[PDB]
Structure 1
């Protein structure tokens, strides 16, 4: 029982480590009133500087390619993007 709960916590933490915006309920609010060094986070999607005429393509993905170089893999299903270089 208790060991099962501990294993659940460990597995959930490991899984949510590889996540863009994992949903973690917190007992207390965090203090981030200072407006500096708030941009270096794993949930900071997009780019620092973005143009209106940038080309974006949405594809099904296998694995977790977030913030990584992606390659096209063709298999039946449509080809998918996978973390690779």
Structure 2
């Protein structure tokens, strides 16, 4: 939900006996297929933009700029990880292609299928279709009653 790692603890030991369908957890930070030549930035985090499209947010001028969940004509990148202690968000610029699990809007998530063009809303959630090239590579997976994730490939601007 609001944390990459489960906020509550667990009362059981994992079986660790199977190898299939084990990467669906929300704590799976980063991309699924990553290149060593990827440009990675970091920014101060305003809110929780984890696994969402991020845009630049400024202030009066007394403090440096930061990144907040957003999209549309102001999209700047995609957040793939967050260090909570330092309040830092890892950003992959939109000029660098990305492939990984991203948050999907809980509206018509069943209609999302592989090959469906997607775009970022004002809250940084992927929504079914403008100016950003993103393609879904799988179907929506439910983590919470309001949390759905989809594997997507973002490859620049239209």
Q: TM-score, normalised by structure 1?
A: 0.74
Say yes or no: does 1:63 pair with 2:43. Answer: no
1:33 Cα offset (Å): 1.4
1:26 Cα offset (Å): 2.2
- Give 1 or 2: higher strand fraction: 2
Match 1:77 to one of 63, 67, 79 = 63
The number of aligned residues is 69
Ranges of 4+ aligned residues in structure 1 off by more than 3 Å: none
For residues 18 and 47 of structure 1, what CA distance do their matches in structure 2 show? 20
For residues 12 and 44 of structure 2, what CA distance do their matches in structure 1 show? 37
SS at match of 1:70: strand
Partner of residue 25, structure 2: 41
Say yes or no: does 1:22 pair with 2:3. Answer: no
Matches within 5 A, 1:1-20: 17-20=1-4
For residues 18 and 25 of structure 2, what CA distance do their matches in structure 1 show? 15
1:51 Cα offset (Å): 0.6
SS at match of 1:48: coil
Q: Alpha-carbon deviations, 1:17-64, whole Å to 9, x = none?
A: 310013433222122311000011100000011111101100001111
- Give 1 or 2: higher helix fraction: 1
Say yes or no: does 1:51 pair with 2:38. Answer: no
